[model samples]
Target: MLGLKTSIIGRRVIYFQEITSTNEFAKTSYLEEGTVIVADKQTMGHGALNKWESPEGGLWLSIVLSPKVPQKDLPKIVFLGAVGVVETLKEFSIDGRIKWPNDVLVNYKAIAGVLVEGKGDKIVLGIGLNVNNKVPNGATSMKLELGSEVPLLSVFRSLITNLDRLYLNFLKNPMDILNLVRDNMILGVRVKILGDGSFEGIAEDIDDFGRLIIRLDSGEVKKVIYGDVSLRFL
Candidate 1:
């Protein structure tokens, strides 16, 4: 049983021992506005672009939201989710940080990814946190970082609670939350955007609309939106 204290988020929960994808289920299922869909394992989990391998011990869940905001502003939801997860990780003495767009990293390795997707007024925010699982080559789990397995349910509780609090705080003043997202990012580091004609630059700041700003070697500041292009740190 999930011991969530949130008033809005995670109130109505649909849990699964195994699912194809929580986001996939959330998009098709008829659920309440703040309903949460959780799973013990995901067979077809995915990150930004590639397929995400979710094992048995990972925490995979998706939340259904109907926030009254323009489509352009929906991107901000990803950062709020990241901040919430990072805040929860702090409780376990894990120094978690944001790695642009959505990934949460610990010691330069990915620990989690926040994926926001939807159409019209319906939004599905999916979170895949590596808990007590064996991760891929570039990934790390909470248990791996701490040298022991953690209480998976406890982590879920903290995540939902923190997400609700951060979501409420974000609704009050969205700019403040955006600033926090920018502040927590790996700023000033050299990064390369992988795609046709890939280019490298110094990672700058995130703009008002959540676009990543980068300063190129030519001294031109370019704003890059999240898309099919993969971001790599040099």
Candidate 2:
């Protein structure tokens, strides 16, 4: 393809003029996996659970994945998506940070989030990136950071590359990918590991399955397998 390499997940990308959610449409068209749909505009873009926003000028897309990962380990895909976005931003010298489950943060503000949807065999990896729009006070984008319009295709092109490279490495050596991702994640940073009711700790690291390694004030290290973990960056 002119935008992405032949290795990534976007083998077939459908561009929607308008839609409620690209993830919803891609899931309906899902056939075995790796079919992507990019929406130019979403009337009702969803975030983590109830946090949804309408992105009129941004990069919103979803990629279908049929990974061989067991059902118990499906949560790892969240980290994979976060890592892919982080890698993509790094390509442009944009310092994007990972916020637990699947959010990409820039300068302590959200720039994107990964929303996974599916049953057992298929998953729709929904991603929303803030491009040429003014997000909330707690959100940001390349446009705001650069004071210029960021080519929409730039994010897609780099993201597909990042996802493809990491996914292939994941198929071969999963552990190594987690190790490197953990290091890049800077796990020991202060953050609230939401889920277990409440877990306030410094992100200690990430385990083999990409779970957040948290270190509490009691000098205890705990692994968070699910739920949302937000970094306080204290």
Candidate 3:
């Protein structure tokens, strides 16, 4: 047991030296809510649409939650994870920003990402953060950005603690969480959404329900819920 400082999130951590994927394990396991699954090395770790490589030395983990909320609201939990990663980055003097719905970016390069999957009443919030690891093109790591290796456990502790605090606040004022997420978003920039047909827009605001509100070049406003879409800032 890691003796997490949080009362709910990460109270029970299931650690593995190596695993296929934390999300897969959490989805298949019979673990209760608030159980955190962390792997030192993930062989098949992935991001949205299974599009990432999880090498060693990064933070690859998943938190399982069974909140009494409807399935439509699960995406907001991914935003919570993004906020946690951004807050943790700030501790290292790195200004991290959220790329709407999932990614945490530093200087326009992705440093962390979140994935949310639901099965029945259970939801698996998977997060992959590049700490002291080697990331691919268009991606970065904390160690690389900070020019030194960061203590992995220290980062994990901050991540879980921030998420726990935000989770508790979310129970009280869900709007507060959304507001914080909006404040930290990479807004007021040109972006592209890779959905059925790619289109560019100006990043506007996030709605109360955590949807990305985009103002198109044709003066049209679109609300995106991030299903099968890839967002990139131009």
Candidate 4:
């Protein structure tokens, strides 16, 4: 084991010259617990729905694992990676926010993004940090916001450390992770969740299991379980 913040992750790190997708590699590698795949350049970067981009100089890495959760609870585990990324950015005083289902935001623009996929017994967590390059949209990066280059290795290290701790804490008490994630969530913000339509409400709080609780105008509450949710400020 690599002796990171947790014993179940980052045991082995594989650096790639280029790959189709780090998540794909991780899922297929059938790597031992704690195996990670990272790349400086990805010829085909994947997001949800197999959407692909070829962003260079970004930190694209994936974690390989067999999580200690039941198969039915996999969707909630996606928040684990989100918590890690948000907490890591906070360490730098960056003040990042998370859109529903885990998109890392810096100053209203996404600086990093995550995608989760699982197989019969393995889970692949893919993360892409827009480190050295800028995308066409408002996507920002550490280098862009700070006006200086950041070492990919440093970002990777921070992510691994935080992920390890977050996952462990989740195992200890799911509510601990749920609470941390809820506090950082945009409770009442109005945003359009593609394919799922739009919702307007104050994000009052998250439930015990991390389900987003949106208190709508009618005084009724709705819980969102899945969507690529984006936020709009009132």
Which one wins on TM-score? 1
lDDT tens string, model 2, 1-234? 465564658777788888988877776764546677888888877867565564667888888887775565666676778888888888878888777667788877888888888755677888888888668877898788778898888778888878877777766656556655665565556877444467677877666667777788998877876554444556
- Specify the poorest-scoring 10-residue window by lDDT in model 2: 225-234
Residue-level lDDT tens digits of model 4 in 1-234: 334555666878898888888887887766886788988778778785535454776778888767676545556667888888888787766777777666778877887778888767787888877777666476788788778887766777888988888777766666577777776766556643334557677767677655667777888777766544544556
Model 2, residue 161: distance off in Å is: 1.9
The 0-to-1 C-alpha lDDT of every candidate, in the order given, reads 0.86, 0.75, 0.86, 0.73
Alpha carbon lDDT at 138, candidate 2? 71
Q: Count steric clashes of candidate 2.
A: 2
Measured on C-alpha atoms, candidate 1 has an lDDT of: 0.86
Could you give candidate 3's per-residue lDDT for residues 49-113 as a string of tens digits? 74567888899999988766555565678888999999999998999999888898899898998
What C-alpha lDDT, on a 0 to 100 scale, does residue 231 get in candidate 1? 95
Each candidate: how many clashes? 0, 2, 0, 3
Model 2, residue 100: C-alpha shift (Å)? 1.4
Better of 2 and 3 by lDDT: 3
In candidate 4, how many Å is residue 212 off?
2.3
* Window of ten residues with lowest summed lDDT in model 4: 188-197
